[PDB]
Design a protein around this ligand. Structure first.
Ligand SMILES: CS(=O)(=O)c1ccc2cncc(NC(=O)[C@@H]3CCOc4ccc(Cl)cc43)c2c1
Ligand SMILES: CS(=O)(=O)c1ccc2cncc(NC(=O)[C@@H]3CCOc4ccc(Cl)cc43)c2c1
Lengths: 305, 300
C-alpha cells in the first residue's frame, strides 16, 4: 500500500554526469560514449546572452577552452559541434559507465525523473511532468543547467530533457537531447513567459484509479458521461481534452478497479464542479496530474530496473 | 526557484541491493563490504508468524540455506548472525560498489530517501519522513522487505531505515540498520496498530519559510505569539509540540527571510484556523510536513 511521487533509480544517469567549464561559466554535461552533451549557452558571456550568435561564438573557441571534469579526472576535448541548442564536446575517452540509452522527445503530460546536478555532481532526484505549456515545475538553483530528465524502460535509459533556463514565474525550460526546446522558448536573455497552463486530465484520472486501488473511494459515483460532455466540462475548468487514446490507455486500470473510464470521468466532473468538501485523495486536497497511467501501473505492480 | 519533494540520488545504494532467499521467502538485502543485512523475518515459516523464536529458528539454519543473489551472480554465505531484528549474512566477497557509509538512527520528523526494491532490483526512489508515531507513509508492495531508507549528505551514505512490515492502516514499520525497530513494533504478525499520528510542526514552519524564500507571502501576518500559546493552539489541530530546539533550528531561515520564528508560528496558527481559502502554498493545498529545516536550506 501507499502511493508516492516516485522517480526512477538514478544510478545509470549519475555515472554520466560531468562538470563543463567554459570561461567563467560552469554547468553540467552528460557523458555518453565519447561525447559530452551540454547547453550551448555555456559559451556565452552576460552580453553574449542578450543577443547571441552561437555559430560565431563557437567558431572562436578551441578544444582546450572547454574544461570537462568527470569526478576528479579532467577529460580531454578533441572536437566540438552544435546540434540545435545543445553543444556536443567530443572527448578522448568513452565513458565506461555508459548505460544502454536512447534520446527520446516526450509529449506534454508525460512524466520523467530529473537528476538535479551542481558542478557535475548529482544532488537530488525528483519526478515531474512536461506541462501542457511545455514548462516543467522543477526545483533548480544557479549551476543546475545541463541536469537531465529521463525514464527507464527495462535496462535502457531514455534521455528526454536537458535543463537550460528558469522563466520569470519560477518554472523551467529546456530541450530534448537533440537540442530542440520544449515550448516556444529561446536560449537567450529576452522577455519570455510561460503560457497559461492546463491540467493533464488523463493523469488526474490515472491518479484517481491509484486512489481506488489504495482504498480511497469516497469520490466514486453511480454516474457515467459521454466523452464529448466530459470534454465540455474539461474545457471550462482549464483541463486538457481527453482523447479516445487516453480512454484506451486507462483500459487496464478500468479493468482492475471495475470503474469504466467514463464512470471515473463523471467522478472527476463532480469533483471539478463541487470540490473535495474538506476531504483528501491520497493525502492531497488538490487533484494530482503528475502521474501517468503507466506510472500508476508501474507503482501499483512493482516493476524493477 | 521551485520547491519539490526531492530524494537523494540512489546510485550509491542501488549498487548494494541484493536478493535474499530463505526457503520460500524472497526479500532484499543490503550488501556492504562482506556482509548482507536483511530483516530476520526472512527465516520465518507459515507457523512462525505469530510468535517466532528467532534464536531457535536461526540455530537450525546453515549457511547454504541462505541464497544471496547480486545481479545474476550467487554470493556464498560463510556465516550468519542476528543483531536485534536484522540478520547479517557474512559473504565470501566484499561488494566492490560499497560506498562510504554510516548507520544512523533517526528521530521522528527526520526525512530520508527510500529505494524501493523487489527481488534485489531497485524499482523507485521517493522521499519519506519518520512520522511522530514512528511509522513511515511509504509505497511498498509484498517483496519490498529489506528496501532501505538513507540520506547522502556529501559523499557518504547514512543508512537509517530498513523496511520490515506494513501495519493494518497501510503505513510502514521498520528498523535502523542495527535491527532496532522505530516505534513499539515487533517483527511478529500479532495485533499491532500505529498510534494516532500528528503533524511535524517544525517541518511545516520550515516549508512556510521555503514558500517565503520562493516569493509566496499571502499567509504572513502582523502577529507574533508566545511559544506556549502557539503550542496550546497547535496541539488542538494534532500538531506536535514546538520546542526551543525547533525554534533554534529555524534560526537561519528566520535570519534569511526576516520573519521571526514566533512571527511565522502566528502565521501557522492563522492557517490552522482559516484554512487556505482556495489558495495554495508551493503548489499544495495542505500544509506540508515532510521537509525538515535542513532540507529547506539544502534545496533553496
Ligand atoms: C536568479 S539566477 O541566479 O539567475 C538563476 C536561478 C535559478 C536558475 C535555475 N535554472 C537555470 C538558471 N539559469 C538561467 O536561466 C540562465 C541565467 C540568465 O538567464 C538565462 C536566460 C536564458 C538562458 Cl538559456 C539561461 C539563463 C537559473 C538562474
Ligand atoms: C498484504 S501482504 O501482501 O502480505 C503485504 C502487502 C504490502 C506489504 C508492504 N511491506 C511489507 C509487507 N510485509 C509484511 O508486512 C509481512 C507480512 C505480513 O505480516 C508481517 C508481520 C511482521 C513482519 Cl516484520 C512482516 C510482515 C507487505 C505485505
Amino acid at each position: 500500500s501507499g502511493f508516492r511521487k516516485m522517480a526512477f533509480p538514478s544510478g545509470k544517469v549519475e555515472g554520466c554526469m560531468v562538470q563543463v567549464t567554459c570561461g567563467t561559466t560552469t554547468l553540467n554535461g552528460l557523458w555518453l560514449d565519447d561525447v559530452v552533451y551540454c547547453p550551448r549557452h555555456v559559451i556565452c558571456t552576460s552580453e553574449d546572452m542578450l543577443n547571441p550568435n552561437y555559430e560565431d561564438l563557437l567558431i572562436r573557441k578551441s578544444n582546450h577552452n572547454f574544461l570537462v571534469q568527470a569526478g576528479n579526472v579532467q577529460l580531454r576535448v578533441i572536437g566540438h559541434s552544435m546540434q540545435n541548442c545543445v553543444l556536443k564536446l567530443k572527448v578522448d575517452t568513452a565513458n565506461p559507465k555508459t548505460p544502454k540509452y536512447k534520446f527520446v522527445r516526450i509529449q506534454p503530460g508525460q512524466t520523467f525523473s530529473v537528476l538535479a546536478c551542481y558542478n557535475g555532481s548529482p544532488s537530488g532526484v525528483y519526478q515531474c511532468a512536461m506541462r501542457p505549456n511545455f514548462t516543467i515545475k522543477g526545483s533548480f538553483l544557479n549551476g543546475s543547467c545541463g541536469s537531465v530528465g529521463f525514464n527507464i524502460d527495462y535496462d535502457c535509459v531514455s534521455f528526454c530533457y536537458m535543463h537550460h533556463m528558469e522563466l520569470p514565474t519560477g518554472v523551467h525550460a529546456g530541450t530534448d537531447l537533440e537540442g530542440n526546446f520544449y515550448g516556444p522558448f529561446v536560449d537567450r536573455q529576452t522577455a519570455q513567459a510561460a503560457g497559461t497552463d492546463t491540467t493533464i486530465t488523463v493523469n488526474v484520472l490515472a491518479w484517481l484509479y491509484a486512489a481506488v486501488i489504495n482504498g480511497d473511494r469516497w469520490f466514486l459515483n453511480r454516474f457515467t458521461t459521454t466523452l464529448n460532455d466530459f470534454n465540455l466540462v474539461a474545457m471550462k475548468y482549464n483541463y486538457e481534452p481527453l482523447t479516445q487514446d487516453h480512454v484506451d490507455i486507462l483500459g487496464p486500470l478500468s479493468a482492475q478497479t471495475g470503474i469504466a473510464v467514463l464512470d471515473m470521468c463523471a467522478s472527476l466532473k463532480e469533483l471539478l464542479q463541487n470540490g473535495m468538501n474538506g476531504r483528501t485523495i491520497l493525502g492531497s486536497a488538490l487533484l494530482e496530474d503528475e502521474f501517468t497511467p503507466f506510472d500508476v501501473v508501474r507503482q501499483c505492480s512493482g516493476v524493477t530496473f
